Amino acid sequence: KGEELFTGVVPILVELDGDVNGHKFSVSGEGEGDATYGKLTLKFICTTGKLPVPWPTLVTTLVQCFSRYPDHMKQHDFFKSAMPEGYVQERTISFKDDGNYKTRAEVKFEGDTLVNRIELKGIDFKEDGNILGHKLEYNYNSGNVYITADKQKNGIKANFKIRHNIEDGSVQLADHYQQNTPIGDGPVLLPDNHYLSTQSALSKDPNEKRDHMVLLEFVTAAGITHGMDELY
Ligand SMILES: [Mg+2]
């Protein structure tokens, strides 16, 4: 099954093409994931020049198959179950009092590398709002991603809120609506309601002159009832 592909360190490639309000840009990322520890280490580079939106607003778009699912809830890991053929991941990201991103990605193996290929379209952003005015801090909050089954499309949906810190002490909300559907025809795991608990750390490469983001993340699945407390 697909979970077998994730028992070790897996190389990752991420490629994004974006248009936000007519600002065209591309990001390329490289690194690896080790789902055993729910761990991602990636460096992203804007290959077209300066990124026209803040790096933190792209973190959710830029591989949920690297979540650590505890053994007792392994039967709820849709993401690995769709591999290697992969899945389509679509989102609408609604920035409160501002514009929205619509994203379409395909996440799949290309040989033994896990690839996330994404098209991002941003519209109706305010020229000097928090996004296009670059008023968001270079940091990121921990949070939960709530997953539910979508049996009609043999997939999942997710609903969650990202809170981006604004440089003035306030918060820019980014409401996320997500739908994933397998690319292949084999059976997948359709989960009970549960969530992914995330933590993310953003940094810079001291030797890198291009516009870039270094990202370290841990993601753990939770929210499924077990009775293992009785064992002890
Ligand atoms: Mg603050």
Identify the three-state secondary structure at position 225: coil
If you ran DSSP here, which 8-state letter would residue 231 be given? G
Between the alpha carbon of residue 214 and those of residues 74, 116, 164, 208, 231, the distances in Å are 29, 17, 17, 10, 41
Position 2, amino acid: G
Helix H or strand E segment including 160: strand 155-165
Q: What is the distance in A from the centroid of ligand 1 to the CA of 165?
A: 6
Per the CB < 8 A criterion, the answer to whether 186 and 166 are in contact is no
Q: What is the distance in A from the centroid of ligand 1 to the CA of 201?
A: 15
Token code pair at residue 177: 């609506």
> Which residue is it, tokens 């690896």?
32
Q: What is the distance in A from the centroid of ligand 1 to the CA of 171?
A: 9
Identify the three-state secondary structure at position 113: strand
Position 184, amino acid: G
Judging by DSSP bridges, how do beta strands 87-95 and 171-182 pair with one another? antiparallel
* Alpha-carbon torsion, ordered 56, 222, 120, 155, to 10 deg: 180
Residues 6+ apart with CB under 8 A from 98: 124, 125, 126, 129, 130, 131, 172
Residue range 1-232 in CATH 3.40.640.10: no
Q: Which residues surround ligand 1, an ion (CB under 5 A)?
A: 169
Per the CB < 8 A criterion, the answer to whether 192 and 224 are in contact is yes
SS (H, E, C) 10-77: EEEEEEEEEEECCEEEEEEEEEEEEHHHCEEEEEEEECCCCCCCCHHHHCCCCCHHHCECCHHHHHHC
Per the CB < 8 A criterion, the answer to whether 81 and 188 are in contact is yes
Residues forming a β-bridge with 88: 106, 181
Task: Count other C-beta atoms under 10 Å from residue 124's C-beta.
Answer: 9
Judging by DSSP bridges, how do beta strands 113-123 and 10-20 pair with one another? parallel
Q: What is the distance in A from the centroid of ligand 1 to the CA of 167?
A: 7
Q: What is the distance in A from the centroid of ligand 1 to the CA of 139?
A: 10
Q: What is the distance in A from the centroid of ligand 1 to the CA of 166?
A: 7
Identify the three-state secondary structure at position 206: coil
Identify the three-state secondary structure at position 119: strand
If you ran DSSP here, which 8-state letter would residue 2 be given? G
Residues forming a β-bridge with 174: 95, 162
Q: What is the distance in A from the centroid of ligand 1 to the CA of 141?
A: 11
Q: What is the distance in A from the centroid of ligand 1 to the CA of 68?
A: 30
Q: What is the distance in A from the centroid of ligand 1 to the CA of 169?
A: 4
> Which residue is it, tokens 């993401």?
79
Q: What is the distance in A from the centroid of ligand 1 to the CA of 172?
A: 12
Residues 6+ apart with CB under 8 A from 29: 12, 13, 14, 15, 42, 43, 44, 45, 62
Q: What is the distance in A from the centroid of ligand 1 to the CA of 163?
A: 12
Residues forming a β-bridge with 106: 88, 117
Which value in Å is the resolution of this experimental model? 1.4
> Which residue is it, tokens 């769709």?
82
